[PDB]
Amino acid sequence: SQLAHNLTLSIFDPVANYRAARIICTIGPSTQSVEALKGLIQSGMSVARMNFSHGSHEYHQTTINNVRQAAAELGVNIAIALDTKGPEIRTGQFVGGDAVMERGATCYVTTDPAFADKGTKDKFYIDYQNLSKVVRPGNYIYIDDGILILQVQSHEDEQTLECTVTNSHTISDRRGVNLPGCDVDLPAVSAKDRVDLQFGVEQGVDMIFASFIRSAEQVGDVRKALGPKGRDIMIICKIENHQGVQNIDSIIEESDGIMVARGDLGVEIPAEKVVVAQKILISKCNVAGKPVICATQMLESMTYNPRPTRAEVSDVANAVFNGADCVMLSGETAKGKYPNEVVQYMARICLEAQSALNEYVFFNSIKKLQHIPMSADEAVCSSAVNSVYETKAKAMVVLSNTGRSARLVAKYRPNCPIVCVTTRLQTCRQLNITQGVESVFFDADKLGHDEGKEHRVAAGVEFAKSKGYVQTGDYCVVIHADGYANQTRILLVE
Amino acid sequence: SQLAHNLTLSIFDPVANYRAARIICTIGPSTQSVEALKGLIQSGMSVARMNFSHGSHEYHQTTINNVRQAAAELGVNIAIALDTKGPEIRTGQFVGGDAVMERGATCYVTTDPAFADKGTKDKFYIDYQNLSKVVRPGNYIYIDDGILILQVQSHEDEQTLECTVTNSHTISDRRGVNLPGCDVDLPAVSAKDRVDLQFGVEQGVDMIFASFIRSAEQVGDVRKALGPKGRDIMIICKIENHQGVQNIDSIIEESDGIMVARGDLGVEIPAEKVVVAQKILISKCNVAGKPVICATQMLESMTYNPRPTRAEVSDVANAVFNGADCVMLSGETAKGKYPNEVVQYMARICLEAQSALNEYVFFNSIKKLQHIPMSADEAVCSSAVNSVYETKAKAMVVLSNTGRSARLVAKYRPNCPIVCVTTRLQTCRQLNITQGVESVFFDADKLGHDEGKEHRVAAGVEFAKSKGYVQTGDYCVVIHAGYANQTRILLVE
Amino acid sequence: SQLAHNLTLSIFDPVANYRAARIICTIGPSTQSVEALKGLIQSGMSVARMNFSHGSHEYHQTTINNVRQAAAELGVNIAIALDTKGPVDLPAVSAKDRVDLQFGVEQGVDMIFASFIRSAEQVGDVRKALGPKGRDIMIICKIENHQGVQNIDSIIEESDGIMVARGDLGVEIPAEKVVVAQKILISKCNVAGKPVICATQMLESMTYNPRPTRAEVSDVANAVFNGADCVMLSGETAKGKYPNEVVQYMARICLEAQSALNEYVFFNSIKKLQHIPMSADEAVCSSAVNSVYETKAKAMVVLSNTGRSARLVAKYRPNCPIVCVTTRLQTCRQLNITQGVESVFFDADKLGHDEGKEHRVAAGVEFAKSKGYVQTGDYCVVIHADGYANQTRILLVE
Amino acid sequence: SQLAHNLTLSIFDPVANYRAARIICTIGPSTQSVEALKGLIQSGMSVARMNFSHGSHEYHQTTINNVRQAAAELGVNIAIALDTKGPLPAVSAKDRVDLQFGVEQGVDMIFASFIRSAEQVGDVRKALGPKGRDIMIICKIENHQGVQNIDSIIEESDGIMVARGDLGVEIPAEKVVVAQKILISKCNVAGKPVICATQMLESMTYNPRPTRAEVSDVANAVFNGADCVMLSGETAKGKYPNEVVQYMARICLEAQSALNEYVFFNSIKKLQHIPMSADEAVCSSAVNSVYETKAKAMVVLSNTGRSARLVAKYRPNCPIVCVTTRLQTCRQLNITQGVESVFFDADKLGHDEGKEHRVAAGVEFAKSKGYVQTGDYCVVIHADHKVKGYANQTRILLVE
Ligand SMILES: O=S(=O)(O)c1ccc(/N=N/c2ccc(/N=N/c3c(O)c(S(=O)(=O)O)cc4cc(S(=O)(=O)O)ccc34)c(S(=O)(=O)O)c2)cc1
């Protein structure tokens, strides 16, 4: 148990010889150059994130090219992620470019396009056309990152709502508006999204961080927007509101993974409930065997300060204790002052947290939830990880072309590194969001199809030796899984 | 498991009708009046903390008097805690009340008392007389809450050390110094502590927060300092350095509880390791069945702002998930702008976290660690909590005079409230640092000795009904526990 | 596990100081006399069986009278059982049965061995035949054919216990399926918490021989390993040449098997089958037996008037003796078909009602000291369970 | 648990399509002929026992010759066992002569009489010499000394025979029942064959039916966890040779339907020390996979039979099919419960280093017996000894 494991711990013991958790970095003005990216890779970046809320297709082209050049110069594989802007509810414009809202006052929000460029403190535009159909009297309208809170009183007509201003705040032009407790029915992908997703497929991005996902249906729309040529690209759904939290089971089932966007969730949902939401979403992904990213507000104060707050450190640590595959950095790397340091410290926190983490609790909890009889794939992978514990094996070798069984093995959480051997470079990149896994590329073009499998097994073991995980005498659990043929060997290392 | 419990959760389901975690508030200028204290009590204060690092005995007497008066008016029992100043290593004084230290410069730290008042940037005094004996070349000296970092180069003589100024910081008169990774051999109690602890006994405080506890022998020193008159006062040891972490096992055995002073630890130990240290100390206390306090840097930004940061909220919630009995507020309530609001919001976080917490994991882990054969006390209490889970009982009633068996039951973490019925008012107050327990005072002088135990059982069940824990048809596990013991699975009428 | 328990055993070790399984003897010409019954009791007889297939009411009246006299002279309580003659369509009770059962109620018998029970509806026929005056007499159903095996769940639910008649069953059912049937009926009675008797063909060849075959010895032992409350002797004590010797030998086989038997396997198996949430009665007894294992208690003390909670505790199988303190002598006699229990009579008319319960608990602990189960320093688990008032104490013996 | 398993049972339901326990028959005047031997085989004989307490070398030669001819005509493999006369020293002078005769004639196993200590096991081993290395030594436990030194005896031997009758001479019968539980369980942990012998269905030597007590005696031997049950005078000098073996098979099959294998599996798994060596881990993991996927058959590739015995130790709830390139392994596995052997002729078919053909042969056999059909799971396993670096392979195979 985790509690019993805590008793045996010492903060003066040397840390684990390997880091399981993965770090996602947002590329921007601070870190776009080849040299800056090489610093990021060496600091511990596994995935490069492109924020498509800003920048032209040419800015992100520079990022793509530079990421590829930096990784190739260091002989590593780095995943490229496209984070979409997504659909947005925003206000219109104001006369004088400004509107002062005072507590107690009455105002009118309208969806009539006439008021888009002449809004005042009394009446202004909101671009979400179905606003009146979704919102009822009693509901709240949040404006400007939820700083301004309006309470709906009644329908003035079909396009206008009577509202009370509950707090004093001054909103400028085109502020973002949130509708807490309301079922927003905006389309899955925006007009800009369809262009950006097309560009993603063309440039061969590894994964999509799909913004503002609310239902399972919308996951299908993002899939269709990618089309037949983008069928292999992973779709990671960003959960940003109550709808995504409510519909999570079906969302997970249709997606390739989940991002817990704490910041976005915090705007509509109380902070203490977001903490619990993080627990829920991470564990559901853990059982599903799909990557989960802890994102936004991670080491934020380290954007301009040389070190973060003690609370920020525990936040990162607990994301790992919760069971997250990945931890994300947004502005800390994008426009930050200490990009290498923040990644280096994040890696240090993850490594420290992993030393305190009793991996067996995860393994045992996930195995307990399996329905008997298990299918071949499930039984093989859980049994293989069980053999790691029972023989005290120091490494695992998984042969997986698509990375399917690699993620399935990683689900069961062994207390040793997992080495995936694959014939596809895309698999190497895409596994960078799966914890406890490292990828060896086996060039089937240059080295044959290895149908006997011995050459790939040898390539995996070789890597494990070079990294110092195993030596002569140690055990290493080798596993193959593709009418579904499979194999498991407990190998004695030469 | 916790992971399995997580899947069933919903952030839209109503929260628990009960909060297990206990809130400790520091009393200062923002909260010393009778009215302000009643505000705190209603907001969710269970323990009033007095910071004896600042203020006269007349000041803390007012706190004591105002707390008791506030509690009397609301008809509740509030614990009074004395937090000692403790022994300290400080720098001397500087000519012109100032010393600007520049990066790369050389300076000299001396233990020569003649330099106490005439120090400069090139040479100054540090009051720890055994500094040269403990510190070796290569070691670091932190000054002014760890902001100024000096590296020791050589012993200039038997009193003076040559040091390199590794970073630029200007320090004023009498700044606190830290010796990371060095065994500080200062006595357990200072001159001030000795006076202050005697005051605490005379005023009848319930518990002592003893600062800078480094070893088990030092707990005995605080024990001896309190004397025979204060033998029933709890000693909660504050872990602040590496010595406290290394000696934790022997300290816990000798103490009545532990405070995890994250901020103090953070000065000398890397933040990430302090996070892990918190896990170690809390779990160790949980197994020992002794109160553990998560203190310092809890909701610090809410001292001057109406709301805290998201990260601060998760810190408080995870303290509960770690298994802390208590969470503590310092400056937030002592000199803060939103004292009622921060206690209320901390209560909200604790209640929310508790709803997501799987107590059975705690119960099962602790039970698994018990050596068979168990003694009567351990067997009775673990069996009683196990009965709760197996019959889905909605409350527990424990008859405990000293609080001993009450603390032992709470150790096993049932998924229902515990109601302790005690004949001592001091037991009511002292149980305020034990999670998931509420105390009902039974006046033995006014209502008789009740050797049948039926009147005390009735009083406990009646309380559980009035709070809405149990109703007719619900099960309630009644337990009284040399060594006499008794367990009943009661059906509520 | 039993396998793990087997590893640590040694046949050369001194045997256990207490026997859990209970022996029932059939009374005939060889054992009817007062002196002969004194021999049976001392050899280890807990229950005397009357076979109403042979002999008149005056023959069985002598048996009843002599059993009571031999028991009183030795200062012990002995259960008297009435095994009916009995009569597939045939009625439950016959005309002779109804006449014989009325005689049983009048003479105050403790239990009925109802012959040839095939359905639960037939258990009710035996109930009516005993009438309102015999509502507290236990009905032990005798399974004799396939119908009894088929309807066993409903029969157990209605009966007060079961007897497995291997001989009768073996007439229509192959011997190898009877062995399995025995396993089934015993285990179901364990889960039900009702006594089960292993009867017929136990040590038959010891009727005229000084010692039985090895195969017969293993049959007695495996009955105890199956988890039977009672082992029964028919003609071995009724018409047999070595009555005292056969009871002494069966007692030795039971004592030996018990030493090899892992009680914890039984405790854990029955606890795992409990539907959560448990009710108060179920949770109190299982938790008390659990506390025995967790503290290594050397005895239990149960306060039970009807013998209900005494049986419920015995169900969960502690690895120590159970001492039941009861205010009624019929409970003492009726618990003689329950394994691992010993009864202590508490005279309420002579020593007060003891609503504080201290005197009954003290007498229980006293019996455990005199029998040498506990001494100063040992733990003893005390339990009372009658809106269902309950109590549990882990007591330190003075 | 066994108790929970009992509740769900019905005596009127169909029996198992497979028998785990194995039957050993003593050959005598009633059964020496080829015709009477063929009858014994079809009645369920797996091992033919020669009692060297009687008869000359020519008599047992006739037994050896006829057993092989009967088996060859029926197309099955039957083990030949040599039960020594015995005496004190371990082996007698006659034993040494007899053991040499057994080696020459190529017997499969020795039932070594009156074994009292571990030192004596090496004496039997020496009496077999270099050419008798591959012959199993099953130690007969006949007195208190054998019981006392059982741990060291099991460690040195290849198996144990519990001789109840002999033990009953000086030890009380009730303690022999307990002693039976001890030796059987100790062999189960060790994973070495154990035989329940003497006084099985004895009355059926001259009667057409045995007593009900004798039937429960046979059943409880299986419930204890015995690999084998042995017949002496019932098949040696008895009136009903075929009937007694058929009825013993009927009891063994009946007990198997009632027996819960998972209890055995869990008990032995719980007794394993962590960390396990690769071969022990692979074998228990493969059996665990059977339960968790509800596999209907196991296939073990084992030439020596070591991993077959190791897999059988953990008691899966399905047949074990062993594929071996040695006929002597086929014979020797006849004293291990729940295993059936398929001879893969390496000279005729090839050495099959890739193992694909032996796996196919194993599955084919399981299909032909009706253990598996299209859609079922079959657990294929191979596990070499430490000397070969624990070379191992496990497959969860979907049957076509
Ligand atoms: O004109 S009249 O002559 O009538 C007249 C009218 C009003 C007057 N007010 N006088 C006072 C005196 C003290 C005082 N608080 N002081 C402290 C303090 O504030 C803080 S802190 O900042 O919260 O941390 C930490 C302290 C640590 C120590 S120490 O460690 O024991 O040394 C000692 C003191 C303080 C305040 S106030 O409450 O701060 O306003 C007001 C005086 C004269």
Ligand SMILES: O=S(=O)(O)c1ccc(/N=N/c2ccc(/N=N/c3c(O)c(S(=O)(=O)O)cc4cc(S(=O)(=O)O)ccc34)c(S(=O)(=O)O)c2)cc1
């Ligand atoms: O993560 S948390 O901290 O919250 C947490 C939550 C729950 C936890 N519970 N873990 C357990 C413990 C025991 C257990 N049952 N085992 C047995 C069993 O099941 C059966 S049965 O026949 O198959 O019924 C027969 C047995 C016979 C014996 S023996 O007679 O001594 O050999 C011994 C054992 C069992 C089970 S479970 O019921 O099997 O799932 C689960 C632990 C931690």
Ligand SMILES: O=S(=O)(O)c1ccc(/N=N/c2ccc(/N=N/c3c(O)c(S(=O)(=O)O)cc4cc(S(=O)(=O)O)ccc34)c(S(=O)(=O)O)c2)cc1
């Ligand atoms: O009668 S037979 O002989 O055939 C027989 C048949 C079945 C038998 N199985 N017995 C068991 C089964 C499970 C088991 N698990 N313990 C758990 C555990 O250890 C951990 S932890 O992570 O390590 O702390 C977390 C758990 C979380 C959950 S859940 O998530 O709440 O479900 C549940 C359990 C555990 C144990 S035992 O407690 O280890 O003894 C014993 C035994 C005998």
Ligand SMILES: O=S(=O)(O)c1ccc(/N=N/c2ccc(/N=N/c3c(O)c(S(=O)(=O)O)cc4cc(S(=O)(=O)O)ccc34)c(S(=O)(=O)O)c2)cc1
């Ligand atoms: O002609 S030349 O003169 O040059 C010439 C060339 C090669 C020669 N080698 N022939 C051999 C010898 C051994 C051998 N494997 N034996 C073992 C074994 O197989 C297994 S296992 O359980 O089945 O895995 C378990 C063992 C346990 C022990 S022990 O426990 O330590 O006693 C000891 C041995 C084995 C093999 S094989 O091919 O691996 O079968 C082939 C001989 C002569």
Ligand SMILES: O=S(=O)(O)c1ccc(/N=N\c2ccc(/N=N/c3c(O)c(S(=O)(=O)O)cc4cc(S(=O)(=O)O)ccc34)c(S(=O)(=O)O)c2)cc1
């Ligand atoms: O929170 S956020 O950080 O996102 C944020 C949000 C709102 C902000 N408010 N005003 C801003 C700020 C920056 C900004 N562009 N700076 C750019 C830049 O610095 C560099 S460079 O690499 O450093 O030389 C390359 C760029 C390439 C393109 S592209 O040609 O269109 O691709 C576009 C811009 C930049 C613009 S603007 O409208 O683009 O002129 C407007 C500022 C930041």
Ligand SMILES: O=C1c2ccccc2C(=O)c2c(Nc3ccccc3)cc(S(=O)(=O)O)cc21
């Ligand atoms: O298991 C074997 C064994 C076990 C215990 C003692 C001795 C042997 C043994 O000698 C032997 C063997 N020897 C051999 C064969 C042919 C020629 C010379 C020697 C060949 C095989 S094979 O399975 O690889 O055929 C298996 C064994």
Ligand SMILES: [K+]
């Ligand atoms: K975005």
Ligand SMILES: [K+]
């Ligand atoms: K957004």
Ligand SMILES: [K+]
């Ligand atoms: K301090």
Ligand SMILES: [K+]
């Ligand atoms: K809860």
Ligand SMILES: [K+]
């Ligand atoms: K009868």
Ligand SMILES: [K+]
């Ligand atoms: K025992």
Ligand SMILES: [K+]
């Ligand atoms: K002999």
Ligand SMILES: [K+]
């Ligand atoms: K079976």
